[PDB]
Amino acid sequence: GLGGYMLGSAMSRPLIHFGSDYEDRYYRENMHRYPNQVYYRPVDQYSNQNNFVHDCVNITVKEHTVTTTTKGENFTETDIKMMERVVEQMCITQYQRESQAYYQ
DSSP notation for 8-36: PPP-PPPPP--SSHHHHHHHHHTGGGS-S
Partnered with residue 40 across adjacent β-strands are: 6
Residues found in the chain = 104
- CA dist 92 and 54 (Å) reads 10
CATH of the domain at 41: 1.10.790.10
Closest CA to 104 of 49, 63, 43, 62: 43
Residues 44/73, Cβ–Cβ less than 8 Å? no
- Residue 75 corresponds to which amino acid? F
- Residue 70 corresponds to which amino acid? T
Contacts 24+ apart (CB under 8 A), 71-76: 73/33
- Provide the residue range defining the domain that includes 90: 1-104
Method: NMR
How many domains does the chain contain in total?
1
- CA dist 95 and 50 (Å) reads 11
Q: Is 14 exposed, middle or buried (0-12, 13-18, 19+ CB in 10 A)?
A: middle
- CA dist 48 and 50 (Å) reads 6
- CA dist 28 and 67 (Å) reads 21
